[PDB]
RNA sequence: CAGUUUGAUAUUGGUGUAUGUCUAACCUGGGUCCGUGAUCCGGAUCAGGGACAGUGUCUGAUGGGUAGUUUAACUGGGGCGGUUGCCUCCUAAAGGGUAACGGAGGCGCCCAAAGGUUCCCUCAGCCUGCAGGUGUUGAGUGUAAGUGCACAAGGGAGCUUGACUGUGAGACCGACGGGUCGAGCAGGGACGAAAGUCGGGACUAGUGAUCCGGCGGUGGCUUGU
RNA sequence: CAGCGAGAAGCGACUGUUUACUAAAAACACAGGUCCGUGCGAAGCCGUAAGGCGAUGUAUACGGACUGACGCCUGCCCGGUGCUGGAACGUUAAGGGGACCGGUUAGCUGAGAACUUAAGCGCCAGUAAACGGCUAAGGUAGCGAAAUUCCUUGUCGGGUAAGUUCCGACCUGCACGAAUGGCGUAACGACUUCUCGACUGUCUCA
RNA sequence: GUGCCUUUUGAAGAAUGAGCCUGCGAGUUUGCGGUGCGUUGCGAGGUUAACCCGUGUGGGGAAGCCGUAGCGAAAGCGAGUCCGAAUAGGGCGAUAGUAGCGCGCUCAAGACCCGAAGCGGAGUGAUCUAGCCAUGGGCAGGUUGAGAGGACCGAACCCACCAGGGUUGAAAACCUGGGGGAUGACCUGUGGUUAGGGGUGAAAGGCCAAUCAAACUCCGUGAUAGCUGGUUCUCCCCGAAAUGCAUUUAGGUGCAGCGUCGUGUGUUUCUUGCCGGAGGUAGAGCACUGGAUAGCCAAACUCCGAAUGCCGGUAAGUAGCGCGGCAGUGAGACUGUGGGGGAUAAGCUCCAUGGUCGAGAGGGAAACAGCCCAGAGCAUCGACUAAGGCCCCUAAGCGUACGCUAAGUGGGAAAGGAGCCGACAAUGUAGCGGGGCUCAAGCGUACCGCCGAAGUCGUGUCAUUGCGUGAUGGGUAGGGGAGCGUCGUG
RNA sequence: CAUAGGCAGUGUGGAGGGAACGAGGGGAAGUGAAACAUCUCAGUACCCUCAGGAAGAGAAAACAACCGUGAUUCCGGGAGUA
């Protein structure tokens, strides 16, 4: 961290913009493409069961996201879901029930 | 001698532009019209 | 443990592909005579040079 | 009381004849209009000549004055 | 910083008109007596001073007496003298770049028009008696030089505020930070019938990174709500 | 065993002390002089304090500063800095005060102006044997090619056969000067300088 | 045929270090640290820390951490997201990891080893020396004459002015001969006492235990060195820099330039021909500006204006680029060419562009890093050549033929004068390397031949690399690889 | 009066030592910042009082967040994160 007296790189560029949120929570996210390979025959999809299939860390909030396509009906019981994912699940005959 | 003025119109009450203007030449509070982005119109911005 | 350079952790951010990004310098004051386009050219984040990124990557953990 | 100079500006022609360019590239950096803008060539704020359309650079004399031209 | 020093406040009370007075806190390195064989100390007791002084906390002044350190670099050794950033020219060897305490100069601004647009005009110099003939750049271009500008970028009028807001295809120059040009699009405007031009000035100097802090706006968020 | 003597100049009055181990001196000290402080739990000094020295002293005493026996003298300047005294008035900290403006849903609470006050400073006088200078005043007395004079081996006189040294004067004082004392001074000096007599292996010259 | 190391542009150097042998002496260790590579296990998962059980190296332990989705200041949205009024344009993202082990680099610790002057804390020192305090002692002898004296002469005693000696001494301050005080501010014994930013000082920064512009000892402590020195076994392949910007900066360092290794790409590199371009140098000229007696001059004059060089395209012929690990270098030297400063100087200094040295052996120039020839894998008692030479030193021509020189010119030089003169410094010929050379062994021009290196060819042999064959193997700083030896363990 | 003081009688009371560890107080500089004063070194070296076999801490005027845990101490994380 020393450029021979010249003003260091880390001391002439401005600090990064903004603050940080001490209580922001990040969800463990599951895309539909990789959620349609764990359940190739449909069925109910609980959070504690998603943990056992190695798709999300333990003890966090899940949020299904909408990348990919789903061809079978899934009854997902998660903490949140994106708009595109919710449409795709419903189109395939599934139902989305949020806890939060 | 030439100070920095801050223009403002009578509606948005948001300081949009700043400019130079010779005091002694234009002692009268300077004025012109600009594009206020809040108002989205070509209103008149009287010097503050 | 390493201690990350407290100064550099406040000035650089790492993207999802590992790129290291900075903010442009010169947009804090004396902004009167800087035309609108110059201020825009100083907005946003700019990528680092390779030699500079190497040192920051190696001084920020 | 001598010994003062202004650091170099790197003026001059940046694209020569027969050189293929993309729209907007700098062709010439100059002070004043030593070369005037021709077909498909624009003038910048500081006399810079830049191509308006992709093509090959070509110099010539249009209307009795040296110009740059872009040939699609 | 020690020291010296000012004021407030605590130790610190009564009473009268900032200033008197009283005695009881407090002070006597004043006298005498006892512990006691004792110039220390303490306790008596008379003699005074006296809510002052001394001391604690807070506070202004002074403070080489002491203490910690700074006191730039370049440089035909060092000191003295001079210079340190930006712009123009020559050295610079017909791209670009290129050094010396090499050769010449400027800048730290200015203009509410000396900006934008539409329209119109051509100068300096010379000759003749405001007028006429000649005169193509030798005048002018806010400001140094250079590259340009007579198709005017020079001169004169009308109208205006683009000396905009949201952007930046693509490129030039720098080790880097950074510096510079920029098509096209949207908003909302100026000028013009229109094509079109307008994101300050013919161009290139007229400026200063981050940290910290001030002012206006907006409403994104921080410790149970 | 057991003094060489004489004339002259410079500095210091003298006897003394000094850089143990390259400088003994013109340096320090001194007796004498002036100024400043101290009223006695003195001032000053060692110590955080007690307690001590000053002193078992008391303005003819003690401490600090400079000059340095003795003789003739010690000129002008108080504008600057410092010191002494006066503080009308201006400014000024803490403290006292709490105008008024906010947050919350009268209370609590945040920031907080006007006003009140000391020293100090600005201000007014004095002070130079105070630091200092000669417009505040522009160097008097005395001395002067000097422990000071670059030019310089100044010029003149004396001394020598020959004198960049020495002695007496001149004054063009680069850049003397009155207690960081001026000019002299009998005696003194393992001090510096010049000259003469006696004497010699210092030398001719070994 | 001019040592070794270090440091240098350059050292046998008369620059530093080493008298010699033997032994000892400098890149280490920690970490569920950071990072890259290799390898191993598992693999959308990987893996434990503390701790628990066990004789051991074994088993358990999911708290955690890394991967799994990103964008934004954040609310938030999410293969998107943020700026934005925008279904405008953009920034950032979308289209196999982890845990050990080994190695390189790195972070914090003394961190490769050695080396200050000095700073701070606590103590020890006035037996030396500087003061003061208490109590004793010493001053032969003779003079002077208010029997006084900081009086006189002079031994003891105290001191140290001069000279000589000594100077690895008899002595870390003395000896010999002179010299000063020698009744006082004197000398001295014994006992006390003042202690380090402190003492004491008739004042020299003197003295305070041979040390004083701040004593000595232990501790912080393995202080700090942008500095100096040292850093130990081998070979194979490649192989620099002394430049630009910035710098409290100039002998340091950051980034860029130049090296190496891994990985991806594959002719993209480079050379030559041709083709398309801009220019304002050399030269030249006066049309502008200036100088100036029809003729002239000019870095900052140009009516003109090459050769080269530069940018791009293309053809033929034979290294380049992206991403990462690790560097060193950033003091350059001379010589050719174009210039500036200097004086129409310098082995001068500052630039641009080549060469060599640096880091380059070998041959030549007598010796002579930078000049001419030439790039050393190793062996060779073969051959041909390069620069340079062929009378003897010394390999090869007293070469052949024509002509010139009379000065030893050759074997140093000017204006100028009629190959010559001009010509002229100091140890010893000394300005051909020496002998000698005009009966050239000198210069010129042809012809013939030969000598001459680690060059090339011939022969044998090893190694790197690409596909039996082609190329390749000097090398300092430095990068990579393969190994020798010592001790110990299974 | 009275106390101060003095006298008499007793106490397996104290005094000093000790390698490291501990609690509470006082508290440097070299060094780093490529200078230096805020800052670091570091509450380290050293010093002072008091101990015990260990010391200290320790039974909520504590956390948390509207759900809840329930004296203190120590170890690995959280994390070189806020």
| Cβ contact C37 with chain G strand, < 7 A | no
Strand, helix or coil at D53?
coil
Q: Which chains touch B (3 or more CB pairs under 8 A)?
A: C
C21 C-beta less than 7 Å away from strand G: yes
Q: How far apart are CA B27 and CA A47, in angstroms?
A: 73
How many C-beta atoms lie closer than 10 Å to residue A51's C-beta? 16
Chain D, 48-67: which CBs lie within 7 Å of strand E? 48, 50, 52, 63-65
DSSP letter assigned to residue C18: S
In terms of C-beta density within 10 A (0-12 exposed, 13-18 middle, 19 or more buried), how is residue B9 classed? buried
Reading the block at residue B44, the tokens are 């008149």
- Taking residue A32's Cβ as centre, other Cβ atoms within 10 Å add up to 23
**Interface D:C, ≥3 CB–CB pairs < 8 Å:** no
Q: Which of residues 1-48 of B touch strand E (CB under 7 A)?
A: 1-2, 13-17, 19-22, 25-26, 30, 32-35, 37, 40-42
Q: Write out the two tokens for A56.
A: 């999300």
- Alpha carbons A49 and A71: distance in angstroms, whole number: 20
Structure tokens at D65: 């004055």
Ranges of H-type helices in A1-100: 9-12, 32-35, 47-52, 83-91
- Nearest DNA or RNA nucleotide to A63 (CA to C1'): G78
Nearest nucleotide to C61 (CA to C1') is G34
Are D26 and D13 a contacting pair, CB within 8 Å? no
C-alpha neighbours within 13 Å on the C-beta side of residue A99 = 12
Bridge partner residues of D67 (DSSP): D36, D60
Measured distance CA(A94)–CA(A5) in Å, rounded? 65
Where does residue A89 rank: exposed (0-12), middle (13-18), buried (19+ CB within 10 A)?
buried
Nearest one of A12, A32, A28 to A90, comparing CA atoms: A32
For residue A96, give both structure tokens: 């989305």
Quick one: which H or E segment has residue A36? none
C11 contact partners, CB below 8 Å, separation of at least 6: A10, A13, A14, A15, A16, C22, C23
For D1-72, list the strands marked E by DSSP: 12-13, 20-21, 26-29, 36-37, 41-43, 49-51, 55-61, 66-71
CA/C1' separation A6–E52 (Å) = 66
Rounded Cα–Cα distance for residues D26 and D50 (Å): 4
Closest residue in C to B16 (Cα–Cα): C32
Q: Can you say how many angstroms the Cα of residue D39 is from the centroid of all Cα atoms in its chain?
A: 12
* Segments of B10-43 assigned E as strands: 18-20, 31-33
Tokens 């650091």, located at residue: D7
**Cα(A74)–Cα(A94) distance, integer angstroms:** 5
Backbone CA torsion sign across D18, D20, D23, D28: negative
Under a CB-based contact definition with an 8 Å cutoff, are residues C11 and A16 in contact? yes
How far apart are the CA of C39 and the nearest CA of chain B, in angstroms? 14
Q: Is D71 helix (H, G, I), strand (E, B) or coil?
A: strand
Which experiment gave this structure?
Answer: cryo-EM
Q: Are C57 and C20 in contact (CB under 8 A)?
A: yes
- Identify which of C12, C25, C55 has the shortest CB distance to residue A12: C25
Give the Cα-Cα-Cα angle A35, A38, A39 (nearest 5 degrees).
90
| Residue of C30, C31, C32, C34 to mutate, interface with B, max B Cβ within 10 Å | C32
- Burial environment of residue A9 by CB neighbours within 10 A (0 to 12, 13 to 18, 19 or more): buried
Q: What is the DSSP letter of D39?
A: T
Are the beta carbons of B47 and B29 closer than 8 angstroms? yes
State, as a whole number of angstroms, the distance between the CA of D47 and the C1' of G84: 32
C36 CB inside 7 Å of strand G: no
Listed residue (D70, D69, D71, D67) closest to D33, CA to CA: D67
The pair of structure tokens assigned to D66 is 């040296």
Sheet holding D49-51, edge to edge: D12-13, D26-29, D49-51, D41-43
Of residues A7, D71, A94, C35, the one with CA closest to residue A32: A94
Strand order in the sheet with A62-65: A28-31, A62-65, A80-81
Strands laid side by side in the B18-20 sheet: B18-20, B4-9, B44-47, B31-33
Tell me the C-alpha to C-alpha distance, in Å, between residue C13 and each of A13, B37, C57.
12, 32, 10
Give the strand order in the sheet containing C20-23.
C13-14, C20-23, C45-47
DSSP-derived 3-state class of residue C44: coil
- E-strand ranges in B1-48 read 4-9, 18-20, 31-33, 44-47
């Amino acid at each position: 961290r020393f450029e021979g007296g010249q003003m260091p790189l880390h001391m002439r560029l401005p600090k990064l913009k903004g603050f940080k949120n001490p209580f922001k929570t990040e969800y463990q996210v599951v895309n539909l493409d990789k959620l349609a390979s764990l359940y190739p025959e449909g069925g109910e999809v609980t959070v504690a069961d998603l943990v056992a299939k190695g798709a999300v860390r333990k003890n966090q909030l899940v949020k299904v996201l909408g990348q990919g396509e789903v061809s079978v009906a899934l009854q997902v019981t998660v903490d949140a879901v994106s708009g595109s994912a919710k449409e795709k699940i419903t189109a395939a005959g599934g139902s989305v029930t949020e806890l939060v | 001698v030439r100070p920095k003025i801050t223009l403002a119109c009578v509606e948005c009450k948001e300081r949009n532009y700043i400019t130079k203007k010779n005091r002694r030449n234009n002692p009268d509070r300077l004025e012109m019209k600009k594009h206020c982005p809040r108002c989205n119109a070509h209103t008149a911005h009287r010097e503050t | 443990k390493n201690k990350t350079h407290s100064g550099a952790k406040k000035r650089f951010k790492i993207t999802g592909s590992g790129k290291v990004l900075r903010e442009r310098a010169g947009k804090r004051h004396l902004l009167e005579h800087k035309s609108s386009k110059l201020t825009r050219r100083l907005t946003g984040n700019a990528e680092m040079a390779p030699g500079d990124s190497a040192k920051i990557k190696k001084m920020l953990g | 009381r001598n010994g003062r100079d202004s650091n170099a500006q790197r003026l001059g022609v940046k694209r020569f004849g027969g050189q293929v360019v993309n729209a907007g590239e700098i062709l010439v950096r100059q002070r004043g209009t030593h070369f005037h803008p021709g077909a498909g060539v624009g003038r910048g704020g500081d006399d810079t000549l830049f191509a308006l359309q992709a093509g090959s650079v070509q110099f010539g004399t249009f209307r009795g004055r040296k110009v740059v031209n872009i040939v699609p």
